[PDB]
UniProtKB/Swiss-Prot annotation:
Family: Belongs to the ryanodine receptor (TC 1.A.3.1) family. RYR2 subfamily.
Name of the molecule in the record: Ryanodine receptor 2
Subcellular location as annotated: Sarcoplasmic reticulum membrane
Domain of life assignment: Eukaryota
Protein role: Cytosolic calcium-activated calcium channel that mediates the release of Ca(2+) from the sarcoplasmic reticulum into the cytosol and thereby plays a key role in triggering cardiac muscle contraction. Aberrant channel activation can lead to cardiac arrhythmia. In cardiac myocytes, calcium release is triggered by increased Ca(2+) cytosolic levels due to activation of the L-type calcium channel CACNA1C. The calcium channel activity is modulated by formation of heterotetramers with RYR3. Required for cellular calcium ion homeostasis. Required for embryonic heart development.
Organism expressing this protein natively: Mus musculus
Protein modification: Channel activity is modulated by phosphorylation. Phosphorylation is increased in failing heart, leading to calcium leaks and increased cytoplasmic Ca(2+) levels.
Gene that produces this protein: Ryr2
Amino acid sequence: TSQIVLPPHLERIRERLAENIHELWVMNKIELGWQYGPVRDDNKRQHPCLVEFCKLPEQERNYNLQMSLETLKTLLALGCHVGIADEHAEEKVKKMKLPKNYQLTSGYKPAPMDLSFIKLTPSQEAMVDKLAENAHNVWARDRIR
């Protein structure tokens, strides 16, 4: 599965979405015991991916935006409406829907909210298998070549 590339109309959202999504997603890689460091290694109990969006270099800056781009580019390629009618609720419309749940410790712990007081759509519950299979699709067009 690889349909199209993204247009730039969402670029008004995308940078604030990046500053959000790195303040959500980077919390996950510390329960093992990892921590920021200079070099790429794990035997000394560290991971340099525990750094903010803009703080990382450009190749690692786009690394955080890439997952959101996967959730965006196939959605826009999906045919169903995914345009920004309900604007994202942080740093553009003061509603404060994004930062709700967190737990700080000795580690990089921003606030990814596990939103579960709402019925998920009938789409993304089906597209869990899609986005998990797209990992192997991306890896398979590399691996078969």
